[PDB]
Amino acid sequence: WTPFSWVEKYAYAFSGPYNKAEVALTFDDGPDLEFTPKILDKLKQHNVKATFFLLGENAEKFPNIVKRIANEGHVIGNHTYSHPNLAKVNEDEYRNQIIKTEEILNRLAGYAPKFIRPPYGEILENQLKWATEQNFMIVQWSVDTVDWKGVSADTITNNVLGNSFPGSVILQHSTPGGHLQGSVDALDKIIPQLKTKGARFVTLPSMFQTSKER
Ligand SMILES: O=C(NO)c1ccc(-c2cccc3ccccc23)cc1
Ligand SMILES: [Cl-]
Ligand code: NA
Ligand code: NA
Ligand code: NA
Ligand code: NA
Numbered sequence: 001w002t003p004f005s006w007v008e009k010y011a012y013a014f015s016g017p018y019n020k021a022e023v024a025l026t027f028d029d030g031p032d033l034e035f036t037p038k039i040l041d042k043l044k045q046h047n048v049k050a051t052f053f054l055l056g057e058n059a060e061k062f063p064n065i066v067k068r069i070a071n072e073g074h075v076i077g078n079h080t081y082s083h084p085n086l087a088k089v090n091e092d093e094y095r096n097q098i099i100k101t102e103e104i105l106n107r108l109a110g111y112a113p114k115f116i117r118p119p120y121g122e123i124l125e126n127q128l129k130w131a132t133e134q135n136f137m138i139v140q141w142s143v144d145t146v147d148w149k150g151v152s153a154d155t156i157t158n159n160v161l162g163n164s165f166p167g168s169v170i171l172q173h174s175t176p177g178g179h180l181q182g183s184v185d186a187l188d189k190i191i192p193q194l195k196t197k198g199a200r201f202v203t204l205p206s207m208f209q210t211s212k213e214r
């Protein structure tokens with residue numbers, strides 16, 4: 001496990017360029033029926049695009065919310081199919097979780113997503129090597145809202161505003177059935193205060209200057 005050396009050897013990163021006044025909001029585990037629509041609305045009221053890492057099994061249940069994300073200018077990412085610990089699977093099951101989710105998202109969004117985020121941040125070097133050759137790009141995160149703990153919006157705001165820098169990639173969740181109401185309300189405080197500091201919200205394709213599709 002050498003996360004640092006991998007950013008020089010593969011398509012793999014934790015944050016973006018230091019010389020741009022840009023940050024990136026990302027959302028995991030969706031789509032869902034309660035939190036994804038709210039996030040989309042608050043992102044609409046703040047003129048902000050984001051990047052959604054969607055589970056393949058959840059895109060099947062709510063195929064229109066996948067389409068709503070892409071139609072509103074957001075970028076869709078691959079978050080595997082059934083959310084397993086990729087460090088505990090073999091190559092064929094790893095490549096099965098990726099390619100299966102890709103075909104589901106390609107059918108709904110109209111493109112094969114280029115960005116992969118491994119659940120729990122767990123991934124192995126050979127898995128990373130395979131995705132690099134397949135023209136993927138894995139992006140983790142550098143600011144953790146730890147919103148799955150069900151924390152409040154004020155707590156998430158101080159946690160985000162206290163650890164955000166140019167190039168920060170922020171992690172939030174739109175998990176079906178999670179305690180994420182404070183994570184949604186935090187967007188009303190996080191987005192304006194970072195704008196006060198001069199930050200612009202971009203998607204992962206714009207931050208790393210690459211296409212959204214593979
Ligand atoms: O994308 C996720 N789920 O879909 C996800 C789940 C949990 C965490 C997560 C939360 C808190 C601390 C962590 C420390 C190391 C690795 C992951 C951590 C980050 C992301
Ligand atoms: Cl490209
Ligand atoms: Na790592
Ligand atoms: Na980094
Ligand atoms: Na950075
Ligand atoms: Na409903």
Ligand code: NA
Nearest residue numbers: 095099130134
């Ligand atoms: Na192959």
Ligand code: NA
Nearest residue numbers: 018165166167
């Ligand atoms: Na920086």
Ligand code: NA
Nearest residue numbers: 015142165168
């Ligand atoms: Na950062």
